[PDB]
Amino acid sequence: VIFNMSMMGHRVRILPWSTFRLNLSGDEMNLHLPQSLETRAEIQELAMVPRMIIVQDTLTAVRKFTKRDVFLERGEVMNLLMFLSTWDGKVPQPAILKPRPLWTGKQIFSLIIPGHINCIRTHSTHPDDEDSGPYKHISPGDTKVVVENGELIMGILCKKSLGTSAGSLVHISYLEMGHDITRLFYSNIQTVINNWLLIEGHTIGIGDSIADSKTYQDIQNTIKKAKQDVIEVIEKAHNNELEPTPGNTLRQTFENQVNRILNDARDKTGSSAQKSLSEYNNFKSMVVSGAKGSKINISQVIAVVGQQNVEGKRIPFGFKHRTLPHFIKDDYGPESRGFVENSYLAGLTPTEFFFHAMGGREGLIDTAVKTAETGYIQRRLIKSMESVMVKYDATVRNSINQVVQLRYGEDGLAGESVEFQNLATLK
């Protein structure tokens, strides 16, 4: 069957319940069935998902799975290997034979890797000085990923290493082996990690949002320092002490100086929040693996939401020289102009809530129009290049047979098989 102009074919499996099942790796859909055998054969040969190409629930667990701390007992290994379709049938020798057998997560994942593919990648939390240090090969934090003969000798996997990119395990396997073998790699990762996840488990709670009292004082101290600094800038402008930059005016220059103070506070406090989270913390696990969320999201939850800019600027004076009736006239302070100093966990003040709504409203309006405009570009581009194709003379021509390019891509090579590399004869 084929469904969503590029469409991906699928092999239908009958299931009892009503809703459609898709191995994503919500929205309603209709699936078309090719009646003719000729097109059915063609669809299964070129339009299949393996030739077209991981969920966020697996990448997060993958990072935990490959951690050196993870050790698997004989009983646990049996379940994980059972779901492995590409298994030779022989249980690998345990890393720690005595006092009791204990298979490391990488050993189980080594069989998941198909064939013999070699690549080197780095974990997200990989210190720069670590590579220059003497412990580059023996990573103190297991932040370096190296695969030899299809075995993950070291390194914790993540989106950078396992996720799609210029260089990744899935990408290397696709070029080295192909699409059919690569699909099994996706299936093995999803199945095996899911079974292991039932043992380790992934969760989230208030404890992740609750940080140590030491960091709370630092966050408030930075917020207090930023607030005092903004007042000092306002006082300088009030007394005409502030001098405008030659490339800007006084009113715009003041808005720039205040923005940096507030912007810097969010980043500095937000960065401290990232260091605050412990390894066991679930918030850190998501961002460290890079699966879902972002460091900014944690910053708004723990440290500070940040400035709520409207139309690229701070909250405008909707009323007479005042953002809201509560604030005095011609007030350019943090609270008045929409600076949100309270994190989501702590709770926003009544003034901040409306300012937050104003900022969110702009995003929703932009998102609503962004999809409408972006979708228009996609259809327009396809029509103007629908007839563009590569002929048998290795030339790009349209329906009228006009030569658009002598060779496809000026080289005559497909854009999928090409791999990124850096020749070292010019630097």
13-42 positions binding another protein, by CB under 8 A? 13-33, 35-42
**Of 113, 211, 219, 315, the one binding another protein by CB under 8 A:** 315
**Of 124, 165, 187, 215, the one binding another protein by CB under 8 A:** 187
Q: Does residue 350 belong to the site contacting another protein (CB under 8 A)?
A: yes
Residues 146-185 that bind another protein (CB under 8 A): 183
DSSP 8-state assignment for residue 8: E
Residue entry with tokens 């000729």: 38
Query: Rounded to the nearest whole angstrom, what is the least distance from the CB of residue 146 to another protein in the complex?
Result: 27
Structure token pair of residue 128: 């720069």
Query: Rounded to the nearest whole angstrom, what is the least distance from the CB of residue 93 to another protein in the complex?
Result: 13
Residues 87-146 that bind another protein (CB under 8 A): 87-91, 99-100
Angle subtended at Cα 108 by Cα 106 and Cα 110, rounded to the nearest 5 degrees: 65
Which range, of 152-160, 239-247, 249-257, 288-296, touches another protein by CB under 8 A? 288-296
CA distance 32 to 43: 12
Residues 199-258 that bind another protein (CB under 8 A): 199-207, 209-210
Give the nearer residue to another protein in terms of CB position, either 91 or 146: 91
Residue 222: φ, ψ to 5°? -65, -45
Query: Rounded to the nearest whole angstrom, what is the least distance from the CB of residue 258 to another protein in the complex?
Result: 19
Query: Rounded to the nearest whole angstrom, what is the least distance from the CB of residue 33 to another protein in the complex?
Result: 5
Give the nearer residue to another protein in terms of CB position, either 233 or 286: 286
C-alpha distances in angstroms, 219 versus 1, 60, 175, 214, 225? Answer: 55, 28, 48, 9, 10
Which range, of 134-142, 143-151, 161-169, 339-347, touches another protein by CB under 8 A? 339-347
Asked whether the beta carbons of 221 and 300 are under 8 A apart, the reply is no
> Where are the alpha helices (H) located in 290-339, listed in sequence order?
295-302
Give the nearer residue to another protein in terms of CB position, either 29 or 423: 29
Which range, of 83-91, 114-122, 154-162, 260-268, touches another protein by CB under 8 A? 83-91
Which range, of 132-140, 144-152, 169-177, 292-300, touches another protein by CB under 8 A? 292-300
Give the nearer residue to another protein in terms of CB position, either 4 or 245: 4
Length, in residues, of the chain: 427
Amino acid at 199: I
Residues 260-279 that bind another protein (CB under 8 A): 278
CA distance 25 to 56: 9
Residue 402 is inside which H or E element, if any?
none
Query: Rounded to the nearest whole angstrom, what is the least distance from the CB of residue 295 to another protein in the complex?
Result: 11
Give the nearer residue to another protein in terms of CB position, either 14 or 97: 14
Amino acid at 220: Q
Structure token pair of residue 90: 């022989």
Give the nearer residue to another protein in terms of CB position, either 87 or 135: 87
Residues 149-176: b if buried by 16+ CB within 10 A, e if exposed? ebbbebbbbbbbbbbeeeebbbbbbbeb
Query: Rounded to the nearest whole angstrom, what is the least distance from the CB of residue 88 to another protein in the complex?
Result: 6
CA atoms within 13 A on the CB side of 13: 4
Q: For residue 99, is the peptide bond before it cis, meaning its omega torsion is within 30 degrees of 0? A: yes
**Of 125, 276, 358, 408, the one binding another protein by CB under 8 A:** 358
**Of 161, 168, 173, 191, the one binding another protein by CB under 8 A:** 191
Number of residues that bind another protein (CB under 8 A): 137
User: What x-and-dash track marks residues 42-81 binding another protein by CB under 8 A?
Assistant: x-xxx-xxx--x-xxxx-xx------------xx--xx-x
CA distance 202 to 60: 8
CA distance 126 to 289: 12
Q: How many CB atoms lie within 10 A of CB 310?
A: 17
Residues 359-418 that bind another protein (CB under 8 A): 359-365, 368-369, 372, 391-395, 397, 401
Residue 230 is inside which H or E element, if any?
helix 213-238
